Amino acid sequence: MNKSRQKELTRWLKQQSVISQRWLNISRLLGFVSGILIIAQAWFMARILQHMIMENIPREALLLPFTLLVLTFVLRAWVVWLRERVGYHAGQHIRFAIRRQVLDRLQQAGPAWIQGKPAGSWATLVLEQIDDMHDYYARYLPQMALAVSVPLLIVVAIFPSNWAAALILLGTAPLIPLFMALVGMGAADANRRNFLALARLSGHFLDRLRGMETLRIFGRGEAEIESIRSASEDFRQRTMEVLRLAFLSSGILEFFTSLSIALVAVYFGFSYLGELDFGHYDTGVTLAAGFLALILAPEFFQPLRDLGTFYHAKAQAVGAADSLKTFMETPLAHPQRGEAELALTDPLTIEAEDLFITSPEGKTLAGPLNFTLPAGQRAVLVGRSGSGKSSLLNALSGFLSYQGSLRINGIELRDLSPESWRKHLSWVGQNPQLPAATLRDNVLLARPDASEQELQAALDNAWVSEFLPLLPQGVDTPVGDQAARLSVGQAQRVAVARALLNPCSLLLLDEPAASLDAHSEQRVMEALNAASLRQTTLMVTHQLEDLADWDVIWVMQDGRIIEQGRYAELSVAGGPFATLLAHRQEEI
Amino acid sequence: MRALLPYLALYKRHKWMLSLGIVLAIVTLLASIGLLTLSGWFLSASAVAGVAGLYSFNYMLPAAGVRGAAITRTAGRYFERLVSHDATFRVLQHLRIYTFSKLLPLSPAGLARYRQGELLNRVVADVDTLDHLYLRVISPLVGAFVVIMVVTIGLSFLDFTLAFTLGGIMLLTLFLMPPLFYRAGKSTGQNLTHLRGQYRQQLTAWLQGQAELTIFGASDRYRTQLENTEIQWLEAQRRQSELTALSQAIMLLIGALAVILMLWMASGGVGGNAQPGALIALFVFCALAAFEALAPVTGAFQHLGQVIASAVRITDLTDQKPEVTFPDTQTRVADRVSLTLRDVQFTYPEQSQQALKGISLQVNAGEHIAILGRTGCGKSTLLQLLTRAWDPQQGEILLNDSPIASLNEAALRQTISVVPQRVHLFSATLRDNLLLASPGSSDEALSEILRRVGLEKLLEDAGLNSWLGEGGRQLSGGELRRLAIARALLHDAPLVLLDEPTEGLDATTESQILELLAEMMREKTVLMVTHRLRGLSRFQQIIVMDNGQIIEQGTHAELLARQGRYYQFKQGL
Ligand code: HEM
């Protein structure tokens, strides 16, 4: 709010710039050399013109003071090029470091936190709100270095000749800061509000553009197009109440520059007419000093003019810094690291008592739990939708923190090493994802090398055995981005093959049967039962068919287990499971 | 430049403001140049006149110049800034209005040829690049050209040779260079765009797959690929910056060349005077001041490529042309309407072999008919066709025995109420989000509509006013259906086309919704599409269709007498 946020944003931007100190110092030194070269060029040009305008000297007799001017021009061009390149490198390094930090934090956050935005906010954040930092740093900071350095050098250079021309330039320098800041400014955080409103107007336009379908049905449009016009009028009228004040600084600076130039010209012009006597230093005012004063006067204020051009670069970076600081300071929870490991050849028995599961930000998600899973058994966790069914799966997978005891063959779960625990799992997702290129790679993701018989007898008549003479290539066909070409079920038969390829000890399923055709569902559940017959399995599903084979059925209501038992004992007792099966039967 | 013509023709509305901005910029530059030139000439002339010249040197006249130059420069700078920032906003508003107006008509049969997401953001970014186009491109080029022409003629009034050499130098600098810096720029821009697209794709894939890439140990071999792509992208950016420095270097060198040429040429008889005197400073100072004014042109060439790409993208998106037309001949509506289909064989222009082969049904006034079937049989196609989104490939459709073609936008959109599958909540107040259906209802009408069956928890809140959507409150499907139905009820129409009204719900909410829909509309003709046959016994005509055709039709009691059509003898799911 107001200044209290602008100041801390600027402070954070300044603080996150200690990774290119050498480059910044090099740029400052190069700026110093541009000063000596401007003063050399001016002295040499004045020297040539006082010999050519007075005390007539043949043109072909000034070759010695003529080549040095060309050398100075060449050196200045070289220095400008070097400054540009150094500034770019200094800008790039900070972006590299910041992107690395952001990606590391996102990786450490976990999958639970990531699936909160529609997969576009993160990329927009990273790219768009990270490039502005380089723009700001590289274009702005060397200019701030130059603006204080060059004028003092010019003042020092001019002083030995005349002490009045130097005092003319000195007089203005206090005035512009004080006048500018006090009367003609004081609304600099108010422009942040205008920029935010301008961005929010584009956001509202985007929201309207997404709703074009729901406006066509109700006959709107011509009656809605007035809203955009009214909002734009309001924004313009609100904006032009502060631009009548923020533009006074340019007028003040131009007025001071013109006043300085005019005063220098008038004083030196009337000096030679025998009407003034201030600073001839007991020798006499010569034209070679007047031309030097006239030439160096524009170079005094030129660094300050460029600062006005770079305002849009700084104001754009603050918007990105706001979101970056908001993201990087959010307090999270994270799971607890583990140290212990266990043997690779033993069944896993899971037990718990008074266990709670917490979201990465806060709030309890699964209430109190009480169960016990014998080794080698198959358990199904059915229940009402929106009851936090898919929370025990994430708790076991190590994506969420928890309170209480969760024991994997005696040992707790906060003590297990992830790199030795995740090797015992195998996951089947509700929404498939293919983070590879070739369809063979999306199958061998578990082990990126194998023989030539597992790709034959992987699963069943699935997309690995059948569904081959339908694609215009073999098993190495490049899938593409997010399996765009494979639309039927989003390939819920390659994920199952990937899970079935590697022999595992605890198979977790998360509604694998969603969005498939009848034959595909039949084959998927056949393969799933064949897989679950071999080891301990924990399945969360909504289909209520062929449940007679499952050992124990859990019903989850409001995060609390209510009834546990076999299908025969639980389809008659009249509990919540009876209501669920009755509703499913009333569906048809 | 061809793509910019249809959008350079959009400035014919506001021309006075742009002309004023250009004139003010030109005036400011001319005032600065004149001030510096006058100061230099006065200094040289006063110095060469000497002490014995005070009675032959009228210095009163050259003071008005050095006063007016300063005053004019200051006022011109200030008002030029103000006027430019006004014109930019006006142009932006006009552009947004035009884009929305030209994008509205082609909503259903349009934007479906691409992926709807990540298109609108591109459109917004393109509009921003276009306003940047206007300012950053239009202003400096015209300003510099006019300033150069004026300076050249003013100097030519004295002596032609030096003036035209200076004019040629400036003209060759302005015209030749930007085309010559527009080839490697194009190449590097293409490479950078390709690399950025690849990096974004890989980042999105990694972020989405982080759920499985951790359980199956893989999320270490993809961060490396991301880093390598980032390295290549940074290499391309560096190759572009190394080119962009050369422009400034060459500009400074050209200014030095011009100044040196002036100094050497004006030393030997400028104007026809072997010992000119007090005029050498004139040309040198004029050249210095003029060449320290061409900075805006140097950076103008960077904005051209992005602007051209954005303009051509918007133009291509806009010229996609509509699909159906409206015979806007005026008509009226009636309180009793009916639906009569006889035969439709419709397929999408994209691909072929879809549903709706020979569908035929007749609906009388004030009759409740429910269409049954599986998913994808063609019910949604019928609903989308009935609102004239697409056009019937071959067949006839009649409302009140009148063809559906001869209807205005207002009449068709008013006489038919639709409850869509997906409900969109605008980022505004509850009052604004709900007054879309009927913009004449008072607060009491809204209050009683809410106090009817539906949402009553939002009634108290902080009041009617609130924030709904991303900014504020969030609703669920059970809280969305009873608001969509409220909107439909407020938009009073004799025919109501309800889409799937119960999917993704629970038992009690579904029963309450069914009671609401049976009671609140007992005269309006209703033709809803369902696939959960709960409560489907109060309808007098049930139609069950599959594989894009009608298998059998009849009343519940009569059609249940020939074995379970979907019940499968009352046994199934
Ligand atoms: C509406 C929000 C905006 C505000 C508050 C704003 C404010 C400003 C300010 C403070 C300056 C600098 C004045 C100085 O140097 O003392 C400026 C200059 C400028 N603005 Fe804006 N501006 C806005 C939007 C825009 C837009 C939409 C454009 C068009 C692309 C634009 C183009 C410029 C240009 C070209 C300059 C002068 C040279 C430059 O800095 O690039 N501004 N504006």
Author numbering:
A (entry chain B): 1 to 588
B (entry chain A): 1 to 573
From the paper:
CydDC is a prokaryotic ATP-binding cassette (ABC) transporter required for heme assembling in respiratory cytochrome bd oxidase, a promising target for drug discovery. In our structures, CydC and CydD form a heterodimer with each subunit composed of one transmembrane domain (TMD) and one nucleotide-binding domain (NBD). TM4 and TM5 of one subunit associate with TM1-3 and TM6 of another to form a helix bundle in a “domain swapping” manner. The overall fold of CydDC belongs to the type IV family of ABC transporters, commonly known as exporters.
